[PDB]
C-alpha cells in the first residue's frame, strides 16, 4: 500500500496537516508506535515557542496513546516516514483555554513544522 | 537504596471524606526542592488547583498521596523522582532526578467543602 496525504483535516476547530515534502508513502505510524520527530512550534503571529531542531535533540514519543496533544496524536499518523509537514492545531486540539504556562497563551492556535524521522526502528 | 512517597500530617481534615480515584479535587500547594527552593505555588497566585485524581493526569506521587488525605487536611508530600519527573525532570523548572516536597491542602472533593 502506498499513499500521500497531501492535505488532511479533522474537525472550525480541529487540526490540519499540510504535506511539505513527501515521505516514502508506505510506512505510517500506528497507535502505540514510537515516533522520532524534529519540530519547530510557532504561534499564529509567527513567533517561535519551541524547537527540537534548535537544541539538536530529536523528540520521541509513543503516538496515539494520549501522551501528546490531540493534534499530534491525530496528525502524525497521517504522515509517512521522512515526510515534512505543517500541523495547524486549534486550541481544542492543543492546550485549550489555559495554554501551557510560560510557553503558550490560552486560546492559542499552534503551527508545528514537523519532520517524521523515525517509526519504531525505521529511519528516514 | 530506598525511594517512595511519604505524607506527613500538618493539620487534620475532617477524617471522613477521602478522594477516590476518578474524583475531582481542589488543592492549594507549594512545591520545593530538597535545597529548600520553591519552584511553584498555587498559594502565591491565590488560585486553587483542580484536577481529576488517580487517572494519571498528575505525577504518580500525587495520584497516590492525595487519596489518603481527608477534606481540609494540610500535609507535606515527599516524592522521590521515580514517583515524580524521573531522570528527565521538567524543562526549565525541575532538575533531573529531583526529590519533590509539596505542601498540600485538600480544599475540596468534587463539590464538597469543609
Ligand atoms: C514532564 C516533561 C516532559 C518533557 C519532555 C518529554 C520534553 C519534550 C521535548 C517537551 C518540551 O520540552 C522542552 C516542551 O515542548 C513544548 O514546548 C512543545 O513544543 C509542545 O507543545 N509539544 C512537544 C512535542 C509534541 C507535541 C507537544 C506535546 O504534546 O508535549 C507534551 C505535553 C506538554 C503534553 C501535555 C501534558 C499535560 C496535559 O494536560 C496536556 O493536555 C493538553 C498535554 C510533552 C511531550 C509531554 O508528554 C512530556 C513532558 O512534558 C511544550 C509546550 C512544553 C514542553 O515542555 C514541558
Ligand atoms: C498543559 C498545562 C497544564 C498546567 C496546568 C493545569 C496548571 C497547573 C497549576 C500546573 C502548573 O502550572 C503553573 C505547573 O506545576 C508545576 O510547577 C508543579 O508544581 C507540579 O509538579 N505539579 C502541579 C500540581 C500537581 C502535581 C504536579 C503535576 O503533576 O503537574 C501536572 C504535570 C506537569 C504532569 C506531567 C504531564 C506530562 C507527563 O509526561 C509527566 O509525567 C511525569 C507529568 C499538571 C497539572 C498537568 O496535569 C497539566 C498541565 O501541565 C509543574 C512542574 C509544571 C506545571 O506547569 C506546566
Number of domains of chain A: 1
Summarize the biggest pleated sheet of chain A.
8 strands, antiparallel
The H-and-E topology of chain A, N to C, reads as: EEEEEHEEE
Oligomer: homodimer
Bound molecules: ligand KXX
PDB class: antifungal protein
Keywords: ssgcid, PPIase
Assembly: dimeric
Entry title: Crystal Structure of FK506-binding protein 1A from Aspergillus fumigatus Bound to Ascomycin
Mind sketching the topology for me?
The structure is a homodimer.
Chain A: E1 7-10, E2 15-21, E3 34-43, E4 48-51, E5 59-62, H1 70-75, E6 84-89, E7 110-119, E8 122-123
Antiparallel strand pairs in A: 1-2, 2-6, 3-4, 3-5, 3-7, 6-7, 7-8
One ligand KXX sits between chains B (29, 31, 39-40, 49, 51, 57-59, 62, 85, 90, 93-94) and A (95, 98, 100-101).
Family (chain A): Belongs to the FKBP-type PPIase family. FKBP1 subfamily.
Domain PPIase FKBP-type (chain A): 32-120
Keywords (chain A): Cytoplasm, Isomerase, Rotamase
Amino acid at each position: 500500500f502506498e499513499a500521500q496525504k497531501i492535505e488532511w483535516h479533522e474537525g472550525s476547530s480541529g487540526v490540519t496537516k499540510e504535506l511539505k515534502s513527501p515521505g516514502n508513502g508506505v510506512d505510517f505510524p500506528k497507535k502505540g508506535d514510537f515516533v522520532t520527530i524534529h519540530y519547530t512550534g510557532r504561534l499564529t503571529d509567527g513567533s517561535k515557542f519551541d524547537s527540537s531542531v534548535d537544541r539538536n535533540e530529536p523528540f520521541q514519543t509513543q503516538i496515539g496513546t494520549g501522551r501528546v496533544i490531540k493534534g499530534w496524536d491525530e496528525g502524525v499518523p497521517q504522515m509517512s516516514l521522512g515526510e515534512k509537514a505543517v500541523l495547524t492545531i486549534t486550541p481544542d486540539y492543543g492546550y485549550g483555554a489555559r495554554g501551557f504556562p510560560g510557553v503558550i497563551p490560552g486560546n492559542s492556535t499552534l503551527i508545528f513544522e514537523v519532520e517524521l524521522l523515525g517509526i519504531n526502528n525505521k529511519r528516514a
